[PDB]
Assembly symmetry: C2
Homo-oligomer: 129 residues x 2
């Protein structure tokens, strides 16, 4: 019912391949590929504040689902997109050629980002605090 | 008397002044000044693994107290220095013209970085898992 929490990355697939596909330099990719950090979500109804840690970067995005917002991506580009909430537990959007699904089941968020033939999947676990 | 844990940044003083002094790009200073993320320490005796979130960056460093190590700073520069343990609860190091003190007080960690007339102070709180 609520996405709010601090989430410890547990495992991911295709980090290097995804970051390569979107144009990040290999030297940066190798520096961040094995970090497993903590991302935070604060949900208040349709409103979300994301503090995402991915690789060597921290990105802070804010959006209300259903409203167009400017979201910073891993390339530094700020993309205009709308994130929708399907049910109470799935956040979906598309930007550039990437389909993103953020799904909360119990305490586990599965984030699946699909770019052509690359499925970049992150599994994180809510720190029960 | 263990530093180990995950710590959420609670407050900080003089981020912008310190980051300017070390020459961080202004765009990174403005993006990162309000981010309050989670850093992690793993301590094994004198050996420490740090996953530090500072501004928009994640930095992973690894060293042993009393032995010279190579550490990545906030600018990405590599520096060679020795980290000492002071008074059994403070990690202290001096690299270039910076003195860093990382002090443990129960669930609170205070990182104080002094550069000339600038004292960059971070106060973080242990996440109870
Ligand atoms: C426009 C969206 C921002 C894209 C930033 C890409 C970095 C990976 C995105 C995954 C974060 C989704 C939240 C779940 C927690 C996590 O996996 O860290
Ligand atoms: C080797 C020098 C450290 C790298 C430079 C990072 C600048 C900020 C350092 C924060 C100290 C991290 C340790 C305690 C946790 C925290 O305060 O987040």
């Amino acid at each position: 019912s609520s996405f709010s929490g601090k989430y410890q990355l547990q495992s991911q697939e295709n980090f290097e391949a995804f970051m390569k596909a979107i144009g990040l330099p290999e030297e940066l990719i190798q520096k961040g590929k094995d970090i497993k950090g903590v991302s935070e979500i604060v949900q208040n109804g349709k409103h979300f504040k994301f503090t995402i840690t991915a690789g060597s970067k921290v990105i802070q995005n804010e959006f209300t689902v259903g409203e167009e917002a400017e979201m910073e991506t891993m390339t530094g580009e700020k993309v205009k997109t709308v994130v929708q909430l399907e049910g109470d537990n799935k956040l979906v959007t598309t930007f550039k050629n990437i389909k993103s699904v953020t799904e909360l089941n119990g305490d586990i968020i599965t984030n699946t980002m699909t770019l052509g033939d690359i499925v970049f999947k992150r599994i994180s676990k809510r720190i029960l605090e």
